[PDB]
Design a protein around this ligand. Structure first.
Ligand SMILES: *C(=O)[C@@H](C)O[C@@H]1[C@@H](NC(C)=O)[C@@H]2OC[C@@H](O2)[C@H]1O[C@@H]1O[C@H](CO)[C@@H](O)[C@H](O)[C@H]1NC(C)=O
Lengths: 5, 327
């Protein structure tokens, strides 16, 4: 649960 | 290149911050489709757990028209995880005769939406009758919210049942386990991406699990991003890792139900982290698990695994697997 880096 | 992706991701988050504010940065996640358009002024958010679609704009001029296009475009967007960049503001060409959301949302009439006219009329209703406002502290954000049908999750899981069925025959992994994992990992979201690089419906990390499955299947290297955003491939790869974790990594656990608990936790946190809960010596760890009851193994993992995620994971998959088990 919401990126990426 | 991963470094290129990490850079763009950094750039993407910053571009949202500048326009929306740090406290308004919403990014796509395993269970959340988020797409920015209009030079980041407009965003579309599908929350798959809660069954809601939220479309927002912070454009100072003609807010309603911005929402209108984002509403229509989201409702009719095609099922194409491979093509769309949820970390760009570029407006992908996505319209489809069979929209991804088709049957998962109904309009003001209670009708499913697969064409621009109904979508457009439904967008007017929402703008005229469900339009909300709130502030940044600096600017007004305008939004409409759409609730998905009550069984939106069953409908999504329906797309993949055949793929699960096959994967289950192919590897000897229960259909109910596979479903419980994809439902818990992604809520059947084909666009799923995590902060820790998990990709797709079953949320596969390329360099760990994806690599290991490729070894058993007699391949060298790594599953590609595009391979894992193909649902049948993703579901086949994820199911193989469950078979691999059971057979090879956690193979020294004798009680099959204990081993199932260990495999569910391991899928998420790695097989080593699961064994290390019991001992730093992988054999001695399995031997310790073998002197316990399955309920105790379950209880140990759900309360003493290092990671709060992996701990919560075991509980959530186990509960879910019950619901899929009958049939
Ligand atoms: C959000 O719903 C979930 C799916 O994502 C989890 C989550 N962790 C949390 C909330 O604590 C966070 O968001 C992306 C990742 O971290 C993700 O967990 C990762 O799930 C996969 C399973 O395919 C693991 O293999 C990853 O290693 C795991 N990340 C970890 C434990 O480093």
């Amino acid at each position: 649960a919401x990126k990426x880096x | 290149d991963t470094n290129g992706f990490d850079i763009l991701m950094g750039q993407f988050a910053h571009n949202i911050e500048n326009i929306w504010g740090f406290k308004e940065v919403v990014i796509a996640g395993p269970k959340d489709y988020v797409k920015y358009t209009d030079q980041y002024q407009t965003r579309s958010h599908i929350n798959f757990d809660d069954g809601t679609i939220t479309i927002e704009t912070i454009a100072g001029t003609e807010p309603a028209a911005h929402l209108r296009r984002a509403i229509i475009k989201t409702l009719l967007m095609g099922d194409d995880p491979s093509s769309v960049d949820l970390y760009s503001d570029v407006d992908d060409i996505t319209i489809s005769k069979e929209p991804f959301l088709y049957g998962q949302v109904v309009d003001n009439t209670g009708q499913p939406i697969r064409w621009e006219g109904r979508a457009s009329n439904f967008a007017d209703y929402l703008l005229k009758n469900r339009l909300k406002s709130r502030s940044n502290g600096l600017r007004i954000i305008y939004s409409v919210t759409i609730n998905m049908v009550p069984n939106h999750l069953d409908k999504r899981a329906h797309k993949y049942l055949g793929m699960v069925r096959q994967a289950s025959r192919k590897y000897g992994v229960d259909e109910s386990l596979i479903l419980a994992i994809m439902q818990t990992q992604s809520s059947f979201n084909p666009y799923a991406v995590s902060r820790s690089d998990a990709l797709g419906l079953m949320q596969v990390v390329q360099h760990t699990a994806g690599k290991d499955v490729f070894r058993s299947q007699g391949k060298s290297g790594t599953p590609s991003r595009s391979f894992l955003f193909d649902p049948a491939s993703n579901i086949d790869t994820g199911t193989a890792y469950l078979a691999m974790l059971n057979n090879v990594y956690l193979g020294g656990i004798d009680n099959p139900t204990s081993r199932r608990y260990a495999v569910i936790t391991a899928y998420n946190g790695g097989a080593g982290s699961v064994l290390r809960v019991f001992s730093n010596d992988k054999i001695q760890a399995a031997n310790i698990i073998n002197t316990m009851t399955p309920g105790d193994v379950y209880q140990t993992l759900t309360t003493r695994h290092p990671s709060a995620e992996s701990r919560r994971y075991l509980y959530k998959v186990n509960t879910a697997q019950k619901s899929y088990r009958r049939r």
